[PDB]
PDB file of C-alpha atoms (C1' of nucleotides) in Angstrom:
ATOM      1  CA  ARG A   1      69.814  80.175  31.835  1.00  0.00           C
ATOM      2  CA  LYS A   2      72.364  81.468  34.348  1.00  0.00           C
ATOM      3  CA  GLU A   3      74.954  81.313  31.564  1.00  0.00           C
ATOM      4  CA  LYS A   4      72.565  83.311  29.372  1.00  0.00           C
ATOM      5  CA  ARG A   5      72.041  85.871  32.152  1.00  0.00           C
ATOM      6  CA  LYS A   6      75.729  86.501  32.943  1.00  0.00           C
ATOM      7  CA  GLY A   7      76.188  88.520  29.737  1.00  0.00           C
ATOM      8  CA  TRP A   8      72.860  90.166  30.436  1.00  0.00           C
ATOM      9  CA  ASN A   9      72.687  93.352  32.479  1.00  0.00           C
ATOM     10  CA  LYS A  10      75.340  96.027  31.950  1.00  0.00           C
ATOM     11  CA  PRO A  11      75.941  96.047  28.151  1.00  0.00           C
ATOM     12  CA  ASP A  12      73.551  95.264  25.292  1.00  0.00           C
ATOM     13  CA  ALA A  13      74.191  91.672  24.200  1.00  0.00           C
ATOM     14  CA  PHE A  14      70.967  91.347  22.186  1.00  0.00           C
ATOM     15  CA  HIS A  15      68.484  93.496  20.300  1.00  0.00           C
ATOM     16  CA  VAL A  16      65.663  91.009  21.005  1.00  0.00           C
ATOM     17  CA  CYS A  17      65.080  88.117  23.408  1.00  0.00           C
ATOM     18  CA  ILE A  18      63.123  84.890  22.923  1.00  0.00           C
ATOM     19  CA  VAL A  19      61.479  83.622  26.122  1.00  0.00           C
ATOM     20  CA  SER A  20      58.840  80.915  26.476  1.00  0.00           C
ATOM     21  CA  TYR A  21      55.480  81.561  28.129  1.00  0.00           C
ATOM     22  CA  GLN A  22      55.900  79.281  31.146  1.00  0.00           C
ATOM     23  CA  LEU A  23      59.467  80.332  32.004  1.00  0.00           C
ATOM     24  CA  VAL A  24      58.383  83.887  32.861  1.00  0.00           C
ATOM     25  CA  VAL A  25      56.337  82.390  35.707  1.00  0.00           C
ATOM     26  CA  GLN A  26      59.444  81.114  37.505  1.00  0.00           C
ATOM     27  CA  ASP A  27      61.839  83.809  36.252  1.00  0.00           C
ATOM     28  CA  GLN A  28      59.324  86.673  36.591  1.00  0.00           C
ATOM     29  CA  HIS A  29      61.458  88.101  39.408  1.00  0.00           C
ATOM     30  CA  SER A  30      64.506  88.241  37.121  1.00  0.00           C
ATOM     31  CA  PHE A  31      62.786  89.452  33.940  1.00  0.00           C
ATOM     32  CA  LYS A  32      60.905  92.273  35.695  1.00  0.00           C
ATOM     33  CA  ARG A  33      64.195  94.001  36.573  1.00  0.00           C
ATOM     34  CA  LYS A  34      65.325  94.918  33.054  1.00  0.00           C
ATOM     35  CA  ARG A  35      63.475  97.585  31.095  1.00  0.00           C
ATOM     36  CA  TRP A  36      61.925  96.580  27.776  1.00  0.00           C
ATOM     37  CA  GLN A  37      60.491  98.279  24.694  1.00  0.00           C
ATOM     38  CA  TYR A  38      58.319  95.662  22.954  1.00  0.00           C
ATOM     39  CA  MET A  39      56.870  92.561  24.591  1.00  0.00           C
ATOM     40  CA  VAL A  40      54.764  90.642  22.062  1.00  0.00           C
ATOM     41  CA  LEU A  41      52.509  87.668  22.791  1.00  0.00           C
ATOM     42  CA  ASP A  42      51.983  84.843  20.307  1.00  0.00           C
ATOM     43  CA  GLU A  43      48.611  83.044  20.113  1.00  0.00           C
ATOM     44  CA  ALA A  44      47.013  85.243  22.795  1.00  0.00           C
ATOM     45  CA  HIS A  45      44.176  82.741  23.328  1.00  0.00           C
ATOM     46  CA  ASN A  46      46.295  81.363  26.197  1.00  0.00           C
ATOM     47  CA  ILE A  47      46.489  84.503  28.384  1.00  0.00           C
ATOM     48  CA  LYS A  48      42.765  85.056  27.709  1.00  0.00           C
ATOM     49  CA  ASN A  49      41.916  83.986  31.278  1.00  0.00           C
TER      50      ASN A  49
ATOM     51  C1'  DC B   1     114.392  55.641  38.345  1.00  0.00           C
ATOM     52  C1'  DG B   2     110.282  58.115  40.857  1.00  0.00           C
ATOM     53  C1'  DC B   3     108.669  62.142  45.097  1.00  0.00           C
ATOM     54  C1'  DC B   4     108.320  67.802  47.517  1.00  0.00           C
ATOM     55  C1'  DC B   5     107.893  72.263  45.668  1.00  0.00           C
ATOM     56  C1'  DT B   6     106.401  75.507  42.413  1.00  0.00           C
ATOM     57  C1'  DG B   7     103.441  77.449  38.949  1.00  0.00           C
ATOM     58  C1'  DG B   8      99.449  77.643  35.894  1.00  0.00           C
ATOM     59  C1'  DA B   9      94.501  77.049  35.857  1.00  0.00           C
ATOM     60  C1'  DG B  10      89.725  77.005  37.363  1.00  0.00           C
ATOM     61  C1'  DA B  11      85.865  77.922  39.995  1.00  0.00           C
ATOM     62  C1'  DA B  12      83.611  78.954  44.424  1.00  0.00           C
ATOM     63  C1'  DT B  13      83.014  82.998  47.551  1.00  0.00           C
ATOM     64  C1'  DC B  14      82.578  87.855  49.289  1.00  0.00           C
ATOM     65  C1'  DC B  15      81.047  91.991  48.862  1.00  0.00           C
ATOM     66  C1'  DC B  16      78.835  95.956  46.779  1.00  0.00           C
ATOM     67  C1'  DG B  17      75.005  98.095  44.299  1.00  0.00           C
ATOM     68  C1'  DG B  18      70.010  97.984  42.062  1.00  0.00           C
ATOM     69  C1'  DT B  19      65.056  97.563  41.854  1.00  0.00           C
ATOM     70  C1'  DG B  20      60.585  95.324  42.868  1.00  0.00           C
ATOM     71  C1'  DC B  21      57.670  93.653  46.922  1.00  0.00           C
ATOM     72  C1'  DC B  22      55.028  93.172  51.353  1.00  0.00           C
ATOM     73  C1'  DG B  23      53.949  93.045  56.328  1.00  0.00           C
ATOM     74  C1'  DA B  24      55.495  96.214  60.913  1.00  0.00           C
ATOM     75  C1'  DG B  25      53.842  99.495  62.756  1.00  0.00           C
ATOM     76  C1'  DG B  26      51.026 103.392  63.182  1.00  0.00           C
ATOM     77  C1'  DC B  27      46.554 105.118  63.481  1.00  0.00           C
ATOM     78  C1'  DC B  28      41.800 104.845  64.771  1.00  0.00           C
ATOM     79  C1'  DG B  29      37.328 102.683  66.882  1.00  0.00           C
ATOM     80  C1'  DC B  30      36.164 100.752  70.477  1.00  0.00           C
ATOM     81  C1'  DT B  31      35.460  98.516  74.908  1.00  0.00           C
ATOM     82  C1'  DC B  32      36.277  95.780  79.247  1.00  0.00           C
ATOM     83  C1'  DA B  33      39.037  94.031  83.205  1.00  0.00           C
ATOM     84  C1'  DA B  34      42.193  96.982  86.155  1.00  0.00           C
ATOM     85  C1'  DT B  35      41.872 100.518  89.679  1.00  0.00           C
ATOM     86  C1'  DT B  36      39.899 102.678  94.008  1.00  0.00           C
ATOM     87  C1'  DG B  37      37.536 102.330  97.859  1.00  0.00           C
ATOM     88  C1'  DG B  38      34.840  99.927 101.612  1.00  0.00           C
ATOM     89  C1'  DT B  39      33.832  95.699 104.403  1.00  0.00           C
ATOM     90  C1'  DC B  40      35.038  91.473 106.808  1.00  0.00           C
ATOM     91  C1'  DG B  41      37.023  87.779 109.102  1.00  0.00           C
ATOM     92  C1'  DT B  42      41.164  85.217 109.219  1.00  0.00           C
ATOM     93  C1'  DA B  43      45.699  82.805 108.889  1.00  0.00           C
ATOM     94  C1'  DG B  44      50.710  84.201 109.988  1.00  0.00           C
ATOM     95  C1'  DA B  45      54.190  86.016 112.820  1.00  0.00           C
ATOM     96  C1'  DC B  46      55.457  86.443 118.134  1.00  0.00           C
ATOM     97  C1'  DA B  47      56.210  84.507 121.778  1.00  0.00           C
ATOM     98  C1'  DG B  48      55.778  80.334 124.968  1.00  0.00           C
ATOM     99  C1'  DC B  49      57.093  76.361 126.521  1.00  0.00           C
ATOM    100  C1'  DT B  50      59.045  71.724 126.060  1.00  0.00           C
ATOM    101  C1'  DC B  51      61.526  67.933 124.837  1.00  0.00           C
ATOM    102  C1'  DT B  52      64.435  65.185 122.311  1.00  0.00           C
ATOM    103  C1'  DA B  53      67.607  63.614 119.070  1.00  0.00           C
ATOM    104  C1'  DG B  54      72.158  65.753 117.288  1.00  0.00           C
ATOM    105  C1'  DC B  55      76.770  67.007 119.132  1.00  0.00           C
ATOM    106  C1'  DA B  56      81.199  66.292 120.807  1.00  0.00           C
ATOM    107  C1'  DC B  57      83.755  62.584 123.011  1.00  0.00           C
ATOM    108  C1'  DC B  58      86.383  58.281 124.936  1.00  0.00           C
ATOM    109  C1'  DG B  59      88.061  53.802 124.318  1.00  0.00           C
ATOM    110  C1'  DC B  60      88.182  48.562 122.695  1.00  0.00           C
ATOM    111  C1'  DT B  61      88.138  45.910 118.271  1.00  0.00           C
ATOM    112  C1'  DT B  62      88.868  44.362 114.441  1.00  0.00           C
ATOM    113  C1'  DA B  63      89.353  45.386 109.140  1.00  0.00           C
ATOM    114  C1'  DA B  64      89.922  47.588 104.965  1.00  0.00           C
ATOM    115  C1'  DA B  65      94.087  50.605 102.802  1.00  0.00           C
ATOM    116  C1'  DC B  66      98.346  50.709 101.485  1.00  0.00           C
ATOM    117  C1'  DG B  67     103.127  49.743  99.798  1.00  0.00           C
ATOM    118  C1'  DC B  68     105.262  46.843  96.942  1.00  0.00           C
ATOM    119  C1'  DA B  69     106.903  42.926  94.035  1.00  0.00           C
ATOM    120  C1'  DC B  70     106.000  40.245  90.210  1.00  0.00           C
ATOM    121  C1'  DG B  71     103.904  39.724  85.459  1.00  0.00           C
ATOM    122  C1'  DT B  72     101.689  38.973  81.372  1.00  0.00           C
ATOM    123  C1'  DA B  73      98.696  40.419  78.067  1.00  0.00           C
ATOM    124  C1'  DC B  74      95.869  43.539  75.820  1.00  0.00           C
ATOM    125  C1'  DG B  75      96.029  48.791  74.181  1.00  0.00           C
ATOM    126  C1'  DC B  76      98.533  50.500  70.821  1.00  0.00           C
ATOM    127  C1'  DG B  77     101.374  51.388  66.747  1.00  0.00           C
ATOM    128  C1'  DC B  78     102.369  49.775  62.305  1.00  0.00           C
ATOM    129  C1'  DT B  79     101.373  47.528  57.846  1.00  0.00           C
ATOM    130  C1'  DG B  80      98.963  45.494  53.793  1.00  0.00           C
ATOM    131  C1'  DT B  81      94.290  44.794  51.719  1.00  0.00           C
ATOM    132  C1'  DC B  82      90.178  45.560  49.345  1.00  0.00           C
ATOM    133  C1'  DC B  83      85.784  47.308  48.778  1.00  0.00           C
ATOM    134  C1'  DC B  84      82.116  50.827  49.190  1.00  0.00           C
ATOM    135  C1'  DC B  85      80.238  55.028  48.943  1.00  0.00           C
ATOM    136  C1'  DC B  86      81.167  59.851  46.802  1.00  0.00           C
ATOM    137  C1'  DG B  87      81.390  62.489  42.491  1.00  0.00           C
ATOM    138  C1'  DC B  88      79.168  62.966  38.091  1.00  0.00           C
ATOM    139  C1'  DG B  89      76.497  62.202  34.024  1.00  0.00           C
ATOM    140  C1'  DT B  90      72.169  60.367  32.160  1.00  0.00           C
ATOM    141  C1'  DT B  91      66.894  58.690  33.083  1.00  0.00           C
ATOM    142  C1'  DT B  92      62.658  59.003  35.228  1.00  0.00           C
ATOM    143  C1'  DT B  93      58.831  60.966  38.229  1.00  0.00           C
ATOM    144  C1'  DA B  94      56.232  64.747  41.515  1.00  0.00           C
ATOM    145  C1'  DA B  95      54.245  68.722  41.435  1.00  0.00           C
ATOM    146  C1'  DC B  96      52.709  73.247  39.716  1.00  0.00           C
ATOM    147  C1'  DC B  97      49.409  75.391  36.654  1.00  0.00           C
ATOM    148  C1'  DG B  98      45.013  75.833  32.973  1.00  0.00           C
ATOM    149  C1'  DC B  99      40.184  74.203  32.187  1.00  0.00           C
ATOM    150  C1'  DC B 100      36.022  74.681  34.354  1.00  0.00           C
ATOM    151  C1'  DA B 101      33.259  75.838  38.888  1.00  0.00           C
ATOM    152  C1'  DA B 102      30.239  74.200  42.591  1.00  0.00           C
ATOM    153  C1'  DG B 103      29.202  73.166  47.606  1.00  0.00           C
ATOM    154  C1'  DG B 104      29.993  71.263  52.954  1.00  0.00           C
ATOM    155  C1'  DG B 105      30.370  70.116  57.635  1.00  0.00           C
ATOM    156  C1'  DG B 106      32.525  71.545  61.820  1.00  0.00           C
ATOM    157  C1'  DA B 107      34.243  74.809  65.108  1.00  0.00           C
ATOM    158  C1'  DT B 108      32.257  79.578  66.501  1.00  0.00           C
ATOM    159  C1'  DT B 109      29.107  82.655  68.647  1.00  0.00           C
ATOM    160  C1'  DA B 110      25.005  83.406  70.963  1.00  0.00           C
ATOM    161  C1'  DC B 111      21.155  81.931  73.560  1.00  0.00           C
ATOM    162  C1'  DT B 112      18.814  78.901  76.823  1.00  0.00           C
ATOM    163  C1'  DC B 113      17.481  76.075  80.804  1.00  0.00           C
ATOM    164  C1'  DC B 114      18.459  72.753  85.113  1.00  0.00           C
ATOM    165  C1'  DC B 115      20.498  70.375  88.454  1.00  0.00           C
ATOM    166  C1'  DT B 116      25.323  68.739  91.123  1.00  0.00           C
ATOM    167  C1'  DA B 117      27.719  70.376  94.270  1.00  0.00           C
ATOM    168  C1'  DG B 118      29.813  74.232  97.532  1.00  0.00           C
ATOM    169  C1'  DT B 119      28.522  75.521 102.031  1.00  0.00           C
ATOM    170  C1'  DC B 120      26.715  74.856 106.297  1.00  0.00           C
ATOM    171  C1'  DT B 121      25.369  71.621 109.784  1.00  0.00           C
ATOM    172  C1'  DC B 122      25.506  67.578 113.253  1.00  0.00           C
ATOM    173  C1'  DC B 123      26.146  62.622 114.309  1.00  0.00           C
ATOM    174  C1'  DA B 124      29.014  58.816 114.486  1.00  0.00           C
ATOM    175  C1'  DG B 125      33.225  55.673 114.210  1.00  0.00           C
ATOM    176  C1'  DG B 126      38.019  54.076 113.139  1.00  0.00           C
ATOM    177  C1'  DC B 127      42.530  53.846 112.655  1.00  0.00           C
ATOM    178  C1'  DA B 128      46.997  55.591 115.409  1.00  0.00           C
ATOM    179  C1'  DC B 129      48.282  54.091 119.775  1.00  0.00           C
ATOM    180  C1'  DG B 130      48.985  51.192 123.948  1.00  0.00           C
ATOM    181  C1'  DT B 131      49.397  46.574 125.540  1.00  0.00           C
ATOM    182  C1'  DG B 132      49.354  40.808 125.301  1.00  0.00           C
ATOM    183  C1'  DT B 133      51.540  37.225 123.658  1.00  0.00           C
ATOM    184  C1'  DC B 134      54.435  33.932 120.909  1.00  0.00           C
ATOM    185  C1'  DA B 135      58.772  33.292 117.558  1.00  0.00           C
ATOM    186  C1'  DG B 136      63.384  33.379 117.225  1.00  0.00           C
ATOM    187  C1'  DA B 137      67.748  33.949 119.017  1.00  0.00           C
ATOM    188  C1'  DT B 138      70.632  33.510 123.442  1.00  0.00           C
ATOM    189  C1'  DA B 139      73.118  31.639 127.303  1.00  0.00           C
ATOM    190  C1'  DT B 140      73.646  28.087 130.381  1.00  0.00           C
ATOM    191  C1'  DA B 141      73.024  22.823 133.427  1.00  0.00           C
ATOM    192  C1'  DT B 142      74.348  18.121 132.047  1.00  0.00           C
ATOM    193  C1'  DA B 143      75.160  13.236 131.180  1.00  0.00           C
ATOM    194  C1'  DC B 144      78.153  11.246 129.246  1.00  0.00           C
ATOM    195  C1'  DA B 145      83.034  11.277 126.957  1.00  0.00           C
ATOM    196  C1'  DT B 146      88.171  11.420 125.861  1.00  0.00           C
ATOM    197  C1'  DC B 147      93.236  11.908 128.072  1.00  0.00           C
ATOM    198  C1'  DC B 148      95.810  11.436 132.407  1.00  0.00           C
ATOM    199  C1'  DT B 149      97.130   9.111 136.460  1.00  0.00           C
ATOM    200  C1'  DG B 150      97.707   6.064 140.272  1.00  0.00           C
ATOM    201  C1'  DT B 151      98.144   1.477 140.496  1.00  0.00           C
ATOM    202  C1'  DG B 152      98.144  -3.165 140.977  1.00  0.00           C
ATOM    203  C1'  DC B 153      99.758  -6.965 138.468  1.00  0.00           C
ATOM    204  C1'  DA B 154     102.786 -12.036 135.926  1.00  0.00           C
TER     205       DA B 154
END
DNA sequence: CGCCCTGGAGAATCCCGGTGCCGAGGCCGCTCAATTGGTCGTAGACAGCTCTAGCACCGCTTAAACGCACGTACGCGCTGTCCCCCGCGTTTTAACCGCCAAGGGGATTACTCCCTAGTCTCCAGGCACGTGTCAGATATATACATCCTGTGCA
């Protein structure tokens, strides 16, 4: 993940990113820094709580 | 034939932004032991006087300190050996959350009696002190006890 995040910030290396549900719990501090346009949730019956 | 010195390579570090996050401090409400004064009685500093071991000293009387000479043997330097834990990759488990919500007992706060001991008081007696007495260690008569000497002998 560090190797994925070293081409991350300054330029645009991707038009979309694929991140698992549970990884945003640990990496929430890193993912909250970058601005985003669309964040979509699959099978929302998880987050329902 | 194989080793210091150089050069290429790699990665670990330092430092400078860049944005989200939370408790340090400020602000208020409040509220209780510090502050001020008076009363009261009480131990500490000031002599006072005394008395007693520390101080400085002098001179026998040994007795450790010292200087040195020898020495020998273990601390140390060097060398060969080998093996054991570090570095790294691959396997395996501990712990967090999600589900899906309930109580539970133990220190806290507040209240409530109740009785053990501080304080005061007087009566008595007991252990620090002075003296009696024996234990141990000390210094000296003493009855033989071992050389020395007249001394008489064969």
